[PDB]
Structure formats: structure tokens, C-alpha cells
Amino acid sequence: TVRTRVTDLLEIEHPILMGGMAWAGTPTLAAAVSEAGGLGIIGSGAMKPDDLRKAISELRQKTDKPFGVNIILVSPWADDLVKVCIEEKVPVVTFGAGNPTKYIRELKENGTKVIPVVASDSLARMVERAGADAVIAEGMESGGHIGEVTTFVLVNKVSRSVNIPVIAAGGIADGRGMAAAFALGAEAVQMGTRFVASVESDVHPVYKEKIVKASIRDTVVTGAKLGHPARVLRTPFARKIQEMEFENPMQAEEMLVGSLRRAVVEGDLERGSFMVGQSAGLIDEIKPVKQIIEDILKEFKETVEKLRGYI
Amino acid sequence: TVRTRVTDLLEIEHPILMGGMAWAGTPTLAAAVSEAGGLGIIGSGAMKPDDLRKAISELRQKTDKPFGVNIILVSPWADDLVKVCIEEKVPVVTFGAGNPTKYIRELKENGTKVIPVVASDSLARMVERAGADAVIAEGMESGGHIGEVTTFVLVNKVSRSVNIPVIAAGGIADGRGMAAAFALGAEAVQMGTRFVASVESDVHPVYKEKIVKASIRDTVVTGAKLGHPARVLRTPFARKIQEMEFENPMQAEEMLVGSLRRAVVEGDLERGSFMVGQSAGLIDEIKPVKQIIEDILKEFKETVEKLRGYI
Ligand SMILES: Cc1cc2nc3c(=O)[nH]c(=O)nc-3n(C[C@H](O)[C@H](O)[C@H](O)COP(=O)(O)O)c2cc1C
Ligand SMILES: Cc1cc2nc3c(=O)[nH]c(=O)nc-3n(C[C@H](O)[C@H](O)[C@H](O)COP(=O)(O)O)c2cc1C
Ligand code: NA
Ligand code: NA
């Protein structure tokens, strides 16, 4: 039903992206998102080029619909992962935090849509010129690495500053979020925590369920003094890291090495980084990916009719 | 034009509140907001009971429309300020951060509408029972004291948790904000920084203009380790306070004593706390209060028509 500049740009059915997620954005879960009319995205967080090549191929076994790949600029294999996306003709590439200008042009030579994740208007506009096709404006309530501006303000300001489509991310978990994000100027939404809490997800069921029971207050920011702030589930281990950032900052940096995997794969609460957004307190049950998208789209429609009721 | 449960509850024309502000919410500026169809609110931040009584009276010299008074629960004269509001029959009382349950019942005996400011659903619901008539859900992007949840998430979650009207605050500066806040479940909006940047305001013109030139990144949070976190303009003096919170926390607490006034009244950047929300980067000019309200209402309407275009 709903169609935007983002639906045209990606030949997509719904304006819903799956956030690139390291260790959580598997080919299985991204395929279900693409089959349901959204845009799944493989999270190449801790992947070597062979891992990504195999993941790309095993996603095309599960769907012929468009999909994307997410690359962390800080990754030791960022350059190689970009070339993997090129020679596999990945339709859409997403970039994590940083400035992916050095990769725009060659990805655009190959017909790949480039959508950087930004946390400021000045960087949104900087990549817009660099050639980017769209921009994901991610507020600080999101899970994983965060910026300093909230979704409510960032999406508004970025939309007015660039002419390419803006995709709101951070805190979106239902049809009200999409409506409000669209009201703020976005033309699609990207969700992470809402798509981890799906039956197609293969995260350790502890993870899914810590999301179900988490309130909107049950997150904290770790890594802020080390320069890389990230939002995780409020847990004793996370408070230990907040302390260790001040007292022993290098021992803290090693305490997080591989901490996301012990959360994702093994559901280890004592040594895991359960990256989640504040949206977790908006999530109350595990739903199949297609049901999530259709529920969000109907509620998005009903919210617009209510907003109409005021005129 | 636009009418909600909040417009009925307050016999107000538009669903726009002026945030209670200490040293900035003067009877002059709140009168202009009430005359323009919104709800001005006197900020009794640093007022003794005589100050508030005189301020209330000198507001009724400037308008006969409804208005409110904001009380800080931490104030040495909170109890006396509440009784002043009673014997002057103030129509609406707003409470700052904390739990104002001890004041609900007696204010409700006197025909005064009680609207606490909350930063969680559990406190929103707790005051809803205590008898509150509405609730201001204030996200962490707001100016002044802040909570831990962003507007995009808090307004959504609080609206579903209570049946009394929810008023979105924090990050709202234009008609898109109102539309998105309404989409999130609110039935009115409260603004602070947008109403400081008005010609009717009497803050030192440095203050207004530091708001004009501030981006959405030009704020920081001070007072977080001392327990009372507040969002101020990103300034060297504010960074000095962030440092002094760790090293000499009691010397820091005295560094903030009266720091809001040197900002408001004297525009002292070296010793002032320029409380502002991230919305400051959405504000580009100084406008008269009535123009602000009508611009916001028209843009609110045009945003709803755009949202309609997607069906
Ligand atoms: C477990 C987890 C891992 C994530 N990993 C990445 C990542 O590797 N790269 C990236 O750019 N974003 C990453 N994100 C952020 C998401 O892509 C998305 O932008 C964010 O989840 C949106 O916020 P939400 O959780 O409120 O929906 C991650 C998020 C989560 C929850
Ligand atoms: C200078 C200033 C002073 C404020 N003082 C108070 C106060 O004394 N009590 C209170 O409850 N809120 C206070 N606030 C918060 C406002 O009432 C309002 O909720 C907030 O400004 C909304 O965020 P916004 O600036 O993005 O519009 C203050 C805000 C500012 C900017
Ligand atoms: Na939850
Ligand atoms: Na500004």
C-alpha cells in the first residue's frame, strides 16, 4: 500500500529497513524481512570476506527480493568487504558509524545503492554530496553504537538539510513510530530491536526475552569515555564496564572484545553486551517477521486517520 | 481549529503549553502565550510566595485567558507555593521532576488542574491514580532537568499506559513535532526553548541568540553524577562543570548555585547555565509568540495532509 521515494529507490514493497546488526543480522532473518516486502540487511560486523560471500549467496537461496549488506568502517576488512559487495552485485550497501566517503564512488559505479548511517545534519549533507542515495538518521535511543541527537530532533533537522530520502532509525517499533517518523520528514524506517524479537531470529532465546521484559528504562550506554558509546541492556556486567571505563580503560576495552557474541549466540548475561534500543520497552511479544510488518503498516494507517480526525 | 481532550480540559484554544521555566517563565511571556490561545505558565523556580503572588496578579493584568504555574518539588517553599496557587485559584498547576502526589488532592479540592511532569510510564501511572488530570511526558532531549528516555519512545509508551491525556515535551519546535507527537499518542505539546526564542521574552538577548546559532549538537548534560542531570548549551563553563562533578563534586554543586540567573538575566557565558533542549538547532529566528503558534498550527496541518498522501 504505502509507497515513498525509498520504495522506488530500492524496488521495495514497504518502507521498512532491517538495521544491519553484527552477529544478529543473519541471512535467515534478513531473508524473512525481504520476503515480507521490507529490506533485510546482512550484518557483516565480525565477518571476513569469505563469511560475507557465503552469507550473501545463502541469502539468495532464500529470496530473490532486494537486500542489503552492512559494513563497519572500523572493521579490519572494510575494504575487502566492500569489494565482496561489488563482485556479488549487492543491491544496497549500508555503512555503520563514521564517514564512508572513500567507498561511495566505486559502489555507485557498480549499481549498488549506498545508504550511510549518520547522526548529524553536517555528516548527512557531507555524504549526500559524496554521492549517497539515501541516509539513515539514527537517534541515540537506538541499540548498538549511538550518537548525541535523539530521533525526534535528528530526523526533523536532517530531512530539511538534504534532498535525498531520509530513513529514520532508533526507537521505531510499531505503526505509531512510522507515522511520527514520516511526520518528522522521513520516507522510511529502519528497525533493529523489533526484528531481533521475531521468531525467524536465531539469537539465544534469552536475548529475545530480555527484550520482551525490558522496559524503556532498562538500557544504559557503555563505552562513552572510550569514544565508542553503545546502548546495551541494563545489566550488572554493563555497569561493571561503565565503572571500568574510568578506572582501567584498557582493561575495559578487552572486557568488551567478543562481548556481543556471548550475548547473541550463548545468551551469557554475565559477559554479554545485549545491544538494544529503548524501543525494547515497546516490545511485548515475539512475532513472525511478516506479522510485524503488516501490524506496523495497518497501525501506521490507523494513526494517519486519527491525525486526520483533528481537521 | 485543532481541538483535543487537552483543549477541553484547560478551556484552551490550541494544544500548546509553555513549559514552566525558572527565571525565564515570566508573567509577560506567559501572558503572550495565553493571549495567543496557548497556555502560558509562570515558572516559580526561584520565587518566594510573595514573588509568586505578585507574578500571578501581574499576569491577570495582561490576560483573562487560562494560565498555569510551575512548582519545583525540591524548592524550599514548595508547600507555601502550592498554597499560594490555591488561594489565588490558579487554573492549572505544573510540577517539575519528582513525585507530586502529596499536593494532588488539595489542589484538586480547589478546582485546580494538576499536570505533573514525568519521565517514565510507572510514574505517569502512579500520578494518574494520585488524581492527576493530565501528564507531561518529557524526553531527555529537553532543556533543563532531564530523564533517561527520549521523546520518541517516552510519549509512545506513556500514552498506552495511562488513560488521562498525555502532553509531549522535549524536542518540539514546529508543526512537524506536533504532528509526530500526536502520532506517538499525545494530545498536546509543551515547548520551552522555542518560547525563549520569542520577542516577548525578556531573557538577555545573548541567550535568545545562542539559541538561534546553536545546532542540534550544541548541548551537553551537566549534573549527571550529582544526581540532577540538566541539559545546557555546550559551553566551556559547562565542560568545566562536567569535569568538576568527578574531581570536586561539592565545589561543583556550588558552581551551579545561581548559574541559571547569570545566563538568563545577564547573559554571562563564563558563569551561566544556558538550559536549552536539542530543539535549539531547529530554531533559526526570533518570532513573536502568536506567530510561533500560528506557524506551528499551519505546518501541523500541512504535515497531516502529507501523511494522508500515503493512502
Ligand atoms: C544487537 C545490535 C547490533 C547492531 N549492530 C550494528 C552494526 O553492526 N552496524 C550498524 O551500523 N548498526 C548496528 N545496530 C543498529 C541497528 O542497525 C539499528 O540502526 C538500530 O537498532 C535502530 O534502533 P532500534 O533498536 O530502536 O530499532 C545494531 C543494533 C543492535 C540491537
Ligand atoms: C531555561 C529553562 C528552564 C527550565 N526550567 C524548568 C523548571 O523550572 N521546571 C520544570 O519543570 N521544567 C523546566 N524547564 C523544562 C521546560 O518546562 C520544558 O519541559 C522543556 O523546555 C521542553 O524541552 P524543549 O526545550 O526542547 O522545548 C526549563 C527549560 C528551560 C530551557
Ligand atoms: Na520489553
Ligand atoms: Na539554532
XYZ file of C-alpha atoms and ligand atoms in Angstrom:
686
model
C 0.000 0.000 0.000
C 2.343 2.718 1.271
C 4.864 3.932 -1.306
C 7.668 6.506 -0.971
C 10.861 7.687 -2.649
C 12.542 4.903 -0.658
C 10.205 2.240 -2.047
C 11.074 3.404 -5.576
C 14.793 3.696 -4.864
C 15.079 0.117 -3.592
C 12.306 -1.525 -5.671
C 10.860 -2.437 -2.277
C 7.260 -3.052 -1.242
C 7.158 -1.380 2.210
C 9.280 1.468 3.573
C 10.800 -0.728 6.285
C 14.519 -1.500 6.567
C 16.147 -4.085 8.805
C 19.073 -2.495 10.618
C 22.447 -4.035 9.852
C 23.434 -5.910 13.029
C 26.689 -7.683 13.881
C 26.188 -11.339 14.917
C 22.378 -10.823 14.794
C 21.727 -9.856 11.160
C 21.898 -13.380 9.717
C 20.951 -14.365 6.141
C 17.948 -16.235 7.573
C 16.458 -13.240 9.382
C 17.240 -10.785 6.562
C 15.661 -13.163 4.043
C 12.396 -13.234 6.002
C 12.381 -9.425 6.046
C 12.933 -9.237 2.281
C 10.356 -11.944 1.574
C 7.821 -9.959 3.627
C 8.293 -6.875 1.399
C 10.799 -4.969 3.541
C 14.572 -4.818 3.088
C 16.585 -7.309 5.085
C 20.258 -6.444 5.554
C 23.169 -8.788 6.307
C 25.244 -7.509 9.229
C 28.906 -8.014 8.268
C 30.057 -6.922 11.714
C 32.555 -9.658 12.513
C 32.705 -11.320 9.077
C 35.749 -11.956 6.942
C 35.251 -11.679 3.161
C 34.532 -15.432 2.822
C 31.916 -15.209 5.564
C 30.203 -12.379 3.700
C 30.392 -14.070 0.295
C 28.890 -17.267 1.715
C 26.247 -15.287 3.616
C 25.247 -13.295 0.510
C 24.897 -16.469 -1.537
C 22.943 -18.340 1.144
C 20.542 -15.393 1.298
C 19.857 -15.551 -2.423
C 18.891 -19.203 -1.789
C 16.034 -17.928 0.380
C 14.700 -14.932 -1.559
C 15.018 -13.154 -4.893
C 13.842 -9.802 -3.470
C 16.225 -6.875 -2.831
C 18.502 -6.943 0.210
C 21.473 -5.070 1.603
C 24.759 -5.548 3.425
C 26.009 -3.505 6.397
C 29.739 -2.743 6.753
C 31.521 -1.309 9.818
C 34.112 1.239 8.646
C 36.273 0.322 11.675
C 36.466 -3.303 10.550
C 39.923 -4.709 9.681
C 38.404 -5.956 6.389
C 36.232 -2.962 5.447
C 37.971 -2.569 2.072
C 37.746 -6.248 1.237
C 34.126 -6.454 2.415
C 33.263 -3.549 0.102
C 34.806 -5.332 -2.875
C 32.930 -8.509 -1.950
C 29.694 -6.486 -2.137
C 30.750 -5.213 -5.577
C 31.622 -8.513 -7.237
C 28.473 -10.096 -5.786
C 26.414 -7.116 -7.072
C 24.773 -6.494 -3.689
C 21.826 -4.139 -4.393
C 22.146 -1.888 -1.301
C 25.134 -1.269 0.977
C 24.710 0.228 4.455
C 27.617 1.746 6.391
C 27.947 1.937 10.151
C 29.152 4.961 12.090
C 31.872 7.070 10.533
C 32.383 8.661 7.119
C 32.097 6.182 4.197
C 33.030 8.704 1.515
C 36.019 6.618 0.388
C 33.633 3.835 -0.686
C 30.738 5.747 -2.291
C 32.077 6.189 -5.805
C 33.178 2.616 -6.544
C 29.934 1.191 -5.114
C 27.977 3.645 -7.294
C 29.976 2.509 -10.348
C 28.504 -0.969 -9.892
C 24.809 -0.159 -9.493
C 24.904 -0.520 -5.699
C 22.717 1.868 -3.681
C 24.713 3.469 -0.854
C 22.881 4.467 2.348
C 25.210 5.698 5.133
C 24.106 5.823 8.769
C 24.554 9.363 10.130
C 23.986 11.144 13.462
C 24.225 14.796 12.361
C 22.984 17.004 9.553
C 26.517 18.100 8.626
C 27.559 14.491 8.031
C 24.233 13.726 6.324
C 24.881 16.547 3.866
C 28.564 15.606 3.501
C 27.691 12.101 2.310
C 24.767 13.410 0.257
C 27.342 15.193 -1.896
C 29.799 12.302 -1.790
C 27.046 10.643 -3.832
C 24.928 8.761 -1.286
C 21.489 7.622 -2.489
C 19.765 7.923 0.887
C 20.694 8.491 4.528
C 19.763 6.613 7.705
C 19.351 9.180 10.504
C 19.814 7.181 13.717
C 18.859 8.707 17.051
C 20.626 7.994 20.318
C 17.785 5.826 21.664
C 18.825 3.149 19.162
C 20.610 -0.065 20.023
C 24.281 -0.506 19.336
C 26.563 2.454 18.743
C 24.808 5.779 19.238
C 25.227 9.464 18.509
C 24.238 12.508 20.545
C 20.928 13.609 18.991
C 17.554 11.980 19.637
C 15.411 10.577 16.827
C 12.710 13.210 17.392
C 15.173 16.031 16.692
C 17.653 14.351 14.298
C 15.103 13.118 11.731
C 13.462 16.553 11.646
C 16.697 18.506 11.134
C 18.322 16.061 8.661
C 15.218 15.934 6.406
C 15.325 19.713 5.917
C 19.078 19.719 5.295
C 19.290 17.121 2.490
C 17.219 16.417 -0.605
C 17.909 12.659 -0.759
C 15.466 10.419 1.165
C 15.944 10.184 4.941
C 15.345 6.901 6.787
C 14.512 7.254 10.463
C 16.186 4.791 12.842
C 16.190 4.427 16.609
C 13.128 3.944 18.777
C 10.798 2.726 15.987
C 8.869 -0.409 16.924
C 5.268 -0.029 15.683
C 2.988 1.889 13.326
C 2.956 4.990 15.549
C 6.732 5.234 15.222
C 6.490 5.078 11.420
C 3.756 7.726 11.319
C 5.716 10.034 13.633
C 8.964 9.443 11.706
C 7.142 10.258 8.460
C 5.682 13.357 10.145
C 9.236 14.359 11.113
C 10.234 14.187 7.430
C 11.416 10.591 6.903
C 10.302 8.428 3.982
C 11.088 5.001 5.502
C 12.042 3.443 8.849
C 14.815 1.107 9.997
C 14.347 -1.215 12.985
C 16.778 -3.435 14.833
C 15.454 -4.432 18.261
C 11.945 -5.034 16.873
C 13.397 -7.521 14.343
C 15.567 -9.334 16.891
C 12.301 -10.044 18.770
C 10.988 -12.200 15.924
C 10.602 -15.962 15.632
C 12.764 -16.056 12.474
C 15.641 -14.680 14.592
C 18.198 -17.189 15.824
C 19.603 -15.206 18.744
C 19.724 -17.118 22.007
C 16.114 -17.090 23.297
C 17.391 -15.362 26.439
C 18.154 -12.351 24.217
C 14.681 -12.209 22.648
C 13.085 -12.428 26.024
C 15.232 -9.923 27.870
C 13.850 -7.668 25.121
C 10.259 -8.692 25.899
C 10.621 -7.958 29.642
C 12.773 -4.848 29.254
C 11.144 -1.510 29.969
C 12.047 1.757 28.259
C 14.352 2.458 31.242
C 16.220 -0.883 31.061
C 19.113 0.313 28.883
C 22.398 2.101 29.613
C 25.228 3.480 27.483
C 28.617 1.753 27.653
C 31.862 2.878 26.049
C 31.205 6.626 26.175
C 34.547 7.627 27.740
C 36.441 5.282 25.391
C 34.975 7.189 22.429
C 32.619 4.467 21.102
C 29.319 4.781 23.029
C 26.856 1.893 22.669
C 23.420 1.224 24.170
C 23.002 -2.154 25.869
C 20.574 -3.837 28.217
C 20.873 -2.566 31.781
C 22.804 -5.383 33.394
C 25.349 -5.767 36.221
C 28.071 -6.610 33.692
C 27.264 -3.404 31.793
C 27.520 -1.366 34.992
C 30.892 -3.032 35.640
C 32.034 -1.764 32.230
C 30.810 1.780 32.937
C 32.942 1.764 36.090
C 35.975 0.170 34.408
C 35.918 2.846 31.679
C 37.123 5.369 34.280
C 39.417 3.246 36.446
C 41.084 0.836 33.994
C 40.097 1.940 30.473
C 42.319 -0.511 28.574
C 41.172 -3.481 30.689
C 37.690 -2.301 29.874
C 38.354 -2.347 26.117
C 39.388 -6.009 26.395
C 36.337 -6.802 28.543
C 34.156 -5.928 25.516
C 36.177 -7.942 22.960
C 33.675 -10.528 21.775
C 31.091 -9.481 24.352
C 28.388 -9.093 21.711
C 28.763 -12.731 20.641
C 28.410 -14.198 24.147
C 25.117 -12.289 24.300
C 23.886 -13.215 20.822
C 24.980 -16.827 20.479
C 25.198 -18.033 24.091
C 22.871 -15.631 25.938
C 25.553 -15.076 28.581
C 24.270 -12.277 30.825
C 27.431 -12.188 32.934
C 29.752 -11.437 29.991
C 27.426 -10.327 27.159
C 26.700 -6.967 25.529
C 22.956 -7.095 24.888
C 22.785 -4.225 22.435
C 19.187 -2.960 22.475
C 17.427 0.327 21.938
C 14.956 1.998 24.263
C 12.341 0.596 21.852
C 12.680 -2.672 23.815
C 10.075 -1.348 26.268
C 7.683 -1.048 23.327
C 8.076 -4.768 22.512
C 5.917 -7.261 24.413
C 5.833 -10.479 22.366
C 7.794 -12.438 19.772
C 6.096 -12.217 16.371
C 6.949 -13.602 12.917
C 8.629 -11.069 10.671
C 5.750 -10.821 8.202
C 3.243 -10.266 11.012
C 5.428 -7.466 12.410
C 5.463 -5.655 9.066
C 1.728 -5.962 8.453
C 0.820 -4.958 12.016
C 3.077 -1.908 11.727
C 1.579 -0.958 8.350
C -2.040 -1.200 9.500
C -1.375 0.705 12.721
C 0.534 3.245 10.636
C -2.646 3.690 8.586
C -4.945 3.941 11.619
C -2.636 6.565 13.140
C -2.898 8.703 9.993
C -6.723 8.520 10.146
C -6.611 9.668 13.779
C -4.313 12.563 12.867
C -6.861 13.340 10.160
C -9.641 13.449 12.770
C -8.143 16.736 14.028
C -9.175 18.540 10.822
C -9.006 24.795 14.609
C -7.348 21.800 16.275
C -9.162 20.537 19.370
C -8.245 17.705 21.767
C -9.002 16.356 25.232
C -6.362 18.841 26.412
C -8.135 21.788 24.785
C -11.339 20.785 26.601
C -9.587 20.114 29.904
C -7.972 23.562 30.027
C -10.622 25.579 28.125
C -7.740 26.393 25.785
C -7.766 27.258 22.089
C -4.663 25.379 20.840
C -2.994 22.268 22.259
C 0.232 24.135 23.030
C 1.669 24.551 26.533
C 4.510 26.826 27.575
C 6.958 24.864 29.705
C 7.366 26.143 33.247
C 10.847 27.708 33.350
C 12.779 29.122 36.305
C 13.944 32.733 35.756
C 12.654 32.569 32.135
C 8.919 31.905 32.551
C 7.913 35.488 33.381
C 4.320 36.787 33.625
C 4.962 38.820 30.459
C 5.973 35.858 28.299
C 3.302 33.534 29.733
C 0.653 36.205 29.149
C 1.556 36.440 25.457
C 1.252 32.653 25.178
C -2.182 32.664 26.827
C -3.374 35.632 24.769
C -2.350 33.752 21.607
C -4.605 30.791 22.526
C -1.998 28.531 24.137
C -1.327 28.073 27.852
C 1.392 30.236 29.328
C 2.847 29.016 32.621
C 4.634 31.035 35.318
C 7.912 29.385 36.324
C 8.126 29.621 40.131
C 11.646 28.206 40.112
C 13.391 30.649 42.427
C 10.316 32.513 43.717
C 9.243 33.012 47.297
C 5.475 33.031 47.948
C 5.276 36.848 47.613
C 7.090 36.680 44.283
C 4.557 34.144 43.030
C 1.526 36.032 44.350
C 2.719 39.250 42.703
C 3.568 37.394 39.486
C 0.140 35.709 39.341
C -1.626 39.029 39.836
C 0.514 40.888 37.290
C -0.314 38.164 34.766
C -4.041 38.627 35.249
C -3.397 42.301 34.380
C -2.294 41.148 30.923
C -4.801 38.418 30.043
C -8.037 36.842 31.236
C -7.332 33.523 29.467
C -6.283 30.358 31.347
C -2.710 30.021 32.599
C -0.675 27.802 34.881
C 2.072 27.862 37.486
C 5.085 25.523 37.643
C 6.459 24.409 41.033
C 9.773 22.622 41.708
C 9.196 19.934 44.358
C 12.798 20.452 45.559
C 12.110 24.111 46.321
C 12.433 25.256 49.964
C 8.965 26.848 49.595
C 7.158 24.129 47.617
C 4.427 23.805 50.264
C 3.897 27.536 50.545
C 3.965 27.988 46.759
C 1.249 25.331 46.446
C -0.966 27.160 48.930
C -0.357 30.425 47.076
C -1.673 28.718 43.921
C -4.747 27.584 45.881
C -5.771 30.895 47.428
C -5.181 32.655 44.100
C -7.280 29.963 42.334
C -4.604 29.269 39.710
C -6.356 27.239 36.966
C -3.523 24.770 36.187
C -0.528 23.737 38.301
C 2.520 22.059 36.749
C 5.085 20.162 38.829
C 8.741 19.694 37.995
C 10.670 16.454 38.356
C 9.805 14.216 41.274
C 6.567 12.814 42.686
C 3.926 15.496 43.460
C 1.425 13.083 44.991
C 1.424 14.961 48.312
C -0.054 18.012 46.550
C -2.608 16.477 44.156
C -5.594 16.149 46.461
C -5.650 19.649 47.966
C -5.122 21.263 44.544
C -7.994 19.143 43.178
C -10.206 20.294 46.077
C -9.895 23.852 44.768
C -10.681 23.353 41.081
C -7.013 23.452 40.049
C -5.954 21.143 37.203
C -2.819 19.187 38.141
C -0.405 18.148 35.366
C 2.822 16.533 36.660
C 5.942 16.268 34.503
C 7.051 12.620 34.285
C 9.892 10.682 32.622
C 8.589 7.104 32.940
C 5.353 5.206 32.463
C 5.417 3.860 36.031
C 5.484 7.393 37.439
C 2.945 8.564 34.842
C 0.546 5.864 36.015
C 1.374 6.493 39.690
C 0.297 10.133 39.450
C -2.638 9.229 37.203
C -4.085 7.369 40.184
C -2.997 10.014 42.680
C -5.605 12.044 40.788
C -3.641 13.936 38.128
C -5.700 15.456 35.295
C -3.026 15.090 32.617
C 0.660 14.202 32.363
C 3.575 15.943 30.642
C 5.885 13.244 29.235
C 9.257 14.978 28.837
C 12.007 13.328 26.822
C 15.701 13.663 27.563
C 16.336 15.983 24.596
C 14.503 18.715 26.518
C 16.139 21.693 28.167
C 16.611 21.846 31.895
C 16.456 18.740 34.049
C 16.110 15.560 32.012
C 15.210 11.908 32.388
C 16.581 8.837 30.632
C 14.025 8.143 27.881
C 13.788 10.021 24.584
C 10.607 11.793 23.488
C 10.109 9.382 20.575
C 9.919 6.403 22.943
C 8.526 8.008 26.135
C 5.442 9.631 24.566
C 4.567 6.370 22.805
C 4.862 4.173 25.907
C 3.210 6.620 28.361
C 0.158 7.172 26.099
C -0.613 3.440 26.099
C -0.095 3.138 29.856
C -2.468 5.885 31.076
C -5.960 6.975 30.087
C -5.566 10.658 31.037
C -4.257 12.976 28.280
C -0.504 12.918 27.610
C 1.368 16.113 26.698
C 4.587 15.596 24.773
C 7.565 17.736 25.809
C 11.182 17.850 24.699
C 12.381 18.461 21.164
C 9.148 20.064 19.871
C 9.750 23.291 17.960
C 7.470 23.319 14.885
C 4.382 21.772 13.301
C 6.209 18.546 12.396
C 6.992 17.987 16.069
C 3.320 18.414 16.998
C 2.176 16.034 14.254
C 4.751 13.412 15.268
C 3.932 13.835 18.978
C 0.232 13.403 18.171
C 1.125 10.343 16.070
C 3.007 8.965 19.091
C -0.185 9.289 21.164
C -0.014 12.791 22.684
C -2.927 15.232 22.649
C -0.942 18.468 23.163
C 2.664 19.710 23.162
C 4.785 21.708 25.606
C 7.696 23.860 24.412
C 10.372 25.727 26.312
C 13.330 26.610 24.083
C 11.026 27.615 21.205
C 9.272 30.123 23.514
C 12.500 31.562 24.927
C 13.384 32.437 21.300
C 10.483 34.885 21.053
C 10.428 38.677 21.022
C 8.073 38.784 24.038
C 10.815 37.020 26.044
C 12.968 39.203 28.269
C 15.983 36.914 28.592
C 19.293 38.588 27.848
C 19.450 38.799 24.024
C 22.660 36.761 24.175
C 20.503 33.847 25.374
C 17.971 34.120 22.535
C 20.730 34.259 20.012
C 22.895 31.455 21.332
C 19.670 29.519 20.699
C 19.439 30.807 17.117
C 23.040 29.799 16.282
C 23.029 26.541 18.241
C 22.928 23.323 16.256
C 21.275 20.107 17.416
C 24.731 19.008 18.661
C 25.411 22.173 20.712
C 24.088 20.867 24.043
C 25.594 18.748 26.829
C 24.281 17.264 30.072
C 25.601 18.665 33.358
C 24.935 17.362 36.854
C 24.524 13.687 35.945
C 26.910 12.290 38.585
C 25.447 14.605 41.250
C 22.026 13.037 40.625
C 20.311 16.040 38.963
C 21.139 15.897 35.223
C 20.327 19.012 33.179
C 20.799 19.886 29.502
C 22.594 23.169 28.813
C 24.259 24.904 25.907
C 27.623 23.380 25.031
C 29.981 25.900 26.565
C 33.457 25.867 28.158
C 31.932 26.627 31.566
C 29.600 23.639 31.161
C 32.535 21.380 30.303
C 34.298 22.691 33.424
C 31.280 21.553 35.457
C 31.272 18.093 33.846
C 34.903 17.711 34.922
C 34.343 19.133 38.419
C 31.491 16.659 39.013
C 34.095 13.872 39.208
C 37.024 15.634 40.876
C 35.401 18.041 43.360
C 31.662 17.264 43.412
C 30.733 19.625 46.259
C 32.671 22.540 44.726
C 30.761 21.734 41.582
C 27.388 21.967 43.352
C 28.287 25.496 44.492
C 29.498 26.416 40.994
C 25.896 25.943 39.777
C 24.243 27.931 42.604
C 22.608 30.803 40.752
C 24.201 29.824 37.447
C 20.855 29.855 35.649
C 20.274 33.508 36.568
C 23.636 34.767 35.270
C 22.637 33.155 31.967
C 19.048 34.414 31.907
C 19.369 37.929 33.289
C 22.977 38.870 32.484
C 23.829 36.569 29.556
C 27.087 35.603 31.272
C 28.590 32.789 29.190
C 31.523 32.278 31.553
C 29.343 31.518 34.600
C 25.862 30.809 33.170
C 23.796 27.643 32.750
C 22.090 28.148 29.392
C 19.449 25.473 29.780
C 18.309 24.536 26.264
C 16.983 21.462 24.536
C 18.314 19.871 21.374
C 15.373 21.657 19.707
C 17.633 24.745 19.652
C 19.077 23.502 16.347
C 15.545 23.611 14.940
C 15.220 27.326 15.805
C 16.614 29.873 13.342
C 14.930 33.213 14.092
C 13.219 35.155 16.869
C 9.462 35.311 16.267
C 6.554 36.838 18.212
C 4.688 34.318 20.321
C 1.466 34.493 18.313
C 3.348 33.981 15.043
C 5.072 30.910 16.515
C 1.739 29.327 17.439
C 0.079 30.008 14.092
C 3.109 28.857 12.087
C 3.228 25.643 14.120
C -0.511 25.055 13.651
C -0.467 25.545 9.879
C 2.622 23.379 9.413
C 0.977 20.821 11.691
C -1.953 20.800 9.256
C 0.228 20.556 6.138
C 2.122 17.642 7.702
C -1.140 15.748 8.262
C -2.109 16.263 4.590
C 1.276 14.873 3.524
C 0.829 11.849 5.794
C -2.570 11.484 4.138
C -0.920 11.453 0.698
C 0.426 7.969 1.526
C -3.091 6.480 1.394
C 22.364 -6.164 18.578
C 22.508 -4.999 17.642
C 23.596 -4.950 16.787
C 23.755 -3.878 15.915
N 24.850 -3.853 15.074
C 25.017 -2.806 14.189
C 26.107 -2.794 13.327
O 26.942 -3.699 13.341
N 26.274 -1.751 12.448
C 25.375 -0.721 12.404
O 25.568 0.189 11.596
N 24.286 -0.727 13.264
C 24.095 -1.762 14.157
N 22.993 -1.781 15.001
C 21.990 -0.661 14.956
C 20.828 -1.058 14.048
O 21.286 -1.153 12.720
C 19.696 -0.040 14.067
O 20.141 1.132 13.418
C 19.200 0.248 15.479
O 18.912 -0.983 16.097
C 17.905 1.052 15.471
O 17.416 1.191 16.794
P 16.234 0.270 17.416
O 16.868 -0.895 18.141
O 15.491 1.099 18.451
O 15.274 -0.215 16.358
C 22.821 -2.840 15.889
C 21.723 -2.891 16.754
C 21.566 -3.966 17.628
C 20.388 -4.006 18.562
C 15.831 27.691 30.673
C 14.878 26.582 31.016
C 14.383 26.492 32.306
C 13.505 25.470 32.649
N 13.026 25.402 33.943
C 12.141 24.405 34.301
C 11.642 24.352 35.597
O 11.983 25.176 36.446
N 10.762 23.359 35.952
C 10.362 22.419 35.043
O 9.569 21.550 35.410
N 10.857 22.465 33.748
C 11.744 23.453 33.364
N 12.222 23.514 32.063
C 11.781 22.495 31.049
C 10.610 23.053 30.244
O 9.491 23.194 31.087
C 10.202 22.141 29.095
O 9.612 20.980 29.637
C 11.372 21.807 28.177
O 11.985 23.015 27.799
C 10.909 21.124 26.896
O 12.010 20.943 26.022
P 12.335 21.924 24.771
O 13.317 22.977 25.231
O 13.026 21.098 23.697
O 11.089 22.561 24.209
C 13.110 24.524 31.701
C 13.613 24.616 30.399
C 14.494 25.641 30.056
C 15.038 25.725 28.657
Na 10.028 -5.123 26.538
Na 19.659 27.239 16.469
